[PDB]
């Protein structure tokens, strides 16, 4: 094993290899970002919001890869599936898909925390609490807020046009 | 009595112990402020306005406590009643309740001015005029304007969204 | 349930609504602060120390309210009970009551942490460790030191006068 | 009468000619200020405190002289009586005499306010409330505080020496 490896169970190492999910989350949001720059969609505020979301998921994946190396695990990269859905529809329908996605990632993150806790890895539980679970709750609450605000503004038409601008 | 007490009636001293009313009004606005940060409400402009209102009612109570000590009275702190509701409805409904609350505090402040006048305490009538009654009238006028503007913008829907931005 | 709620058990949500206990603590220390500005007490250093304590305790409560909303729980505000006393005695007696109130809050916060651990909510255990338990131990240690310093300086008379200046 | 006098009653004009009382209080504090600079007293903080008090009482008299002229009345100066004592005792005893004199002046001001109210002179009641009664209550609270602090420090000996310093 690695000269650095210590108290790092093979179950966590393989669970970390979550990297693929973060990269998938990054790619969903990249799809969303450029869907909204379409000449027949033209929602630059949503575009910028999802471009940033895509960058952050990719960084989240890179922190996990860096963590793999710190502990002596070995990174195994797999293919990144494309989103099954290309036409995200309205801004509200994209936000509802992002909420669900943000929410599947956080379940995965909470499952990896339970694995880490069961195998008495406090370095891993600390990482997850400080670098991931905190960000995930903020992101989910934010998107919820955005959904509520867009339904108030009027999920389609003028309210969608005005909500996009406060988002730019 | 206190070595500093002079021309200070025990009825005014009891009426000042108004301190409880200000703290309650501060507690109503704190309730409103965080209600507007719910993920299913998300009115960040209403939230801020009522966060500022809550701080500045609490400062009102502290100026009364300091006054109590200045004149040689003794501060008796009572329980702060829970705010009359959990949920405050629309932003319009919350402005209406704040208007009702502001006029109730004004009426209490005017009654304390009458007691102070009746017992020939010009230092108290000065306090109430310069530090409370002026700002109460200004506050009541502000909230009334805001109610008129929000009814104009359309008390619900896009108008509430756009009026909230104004207020942020 | 809220669109954002996940892994948020109803017992933790009820226990968070700790908010009331924070607000009560804020109200005890506000009572202390203005007691020490009485013309027959005049301890401006103690007064400043407890004004600041009262601000901090109200901020802790607001962070619990902001937290209740992040997780999708609902804030249920409560009456704030009067401080058990009008008058707090010597500066030492006020410090001793504060130490005891700080330990009572710490026990409550430890109990909330237990229930959060038992229901496998690491986002909430992180909140409690990073935002409350650390500060709580530092505050208790601080008041311990002060009690020791004030007994050394001579809890009454000139020593209390000199200790108070060091606190201003 | 003057080209300016309007709603100015003769008994208020004679009550303002308070000028003499302010000048006497100024002279008392001038006596205290230099008493505390005697080589066998040597209390520079008390000395500075009373120097400033004497300056401020003189300004109060001057504002009344200006006020007399503003209203069309005529200033009649009278003999300024000597302070009743050459020597003021301990620091505590000087503060007690000053408290007594602050309350005698305050009472005189309150009687002039009643006179002004009975003759429906709101210009003069505003003068009194804003330029004298407010500063008078603050002065009395301050001196009250100082007396309690000095008794706490230990009205004589080391405590008197330390308290004078915090006053410097
Ligand atoms: Fe992520
Ligand atoms: Fe107020
Ligand atoms: Fe706290
Ligand atoms: Fe004066
Ligand atoms: Hg593991
Ligand atoms: Hg009264
Ligand atoms: Hg729980
Ligand atoms: Hg008069």
Author numbering:
A (entry chain E), B (entry chain C), C (entry chain D), D (entry chain B): 2 to 18, 20 to 56, 58 to 99, 101 to 172
From the paper:
In this study, for the first time, we demonstrated that the ferritin from kuruma prawns (Marsupenaeus japonicus), named MjF, has a pronouncedly larger ability to resist denaturation induced by Cd2+ and Hg2+ as compared to its analogue, human H-chain ferritin (HuHF), despite the fact that these two proteins share a high similarity in protein structure.
To obtain direct evidence for the binding of Hg2+ and Cd2+ to MjF, we tried to crystallize MjF upon mixing with heavy metal ions (Hg2+ and Cd2+, respectively) by screening a wide range of solution conditions at 20 °C. Eventually, we were able to crystallize both complexes of MjF plus Hg2+ and MjF plus Cd2+ with good diffraction and solved their structure at a resolution of 2.3 Å (I4 space group) and 3.0 Å (P6322 space group), respectively. Hg2+ binds to the thiolate groups of Cys13 with a distance of 2.4 Å, while it binds to Asn123 with a distance of 2.2 Å. We also found positive electron density map around the ferroxidase site, but it is not clear that the electron density is occupied by Hg2+. However, the presence of Hg2+ could neutralize the inherent negative charges occurring at the 3-fold channels, slowing down the rate of iron ions across the channels to reach the ferroxidase center where they are oxidized by oxygen.
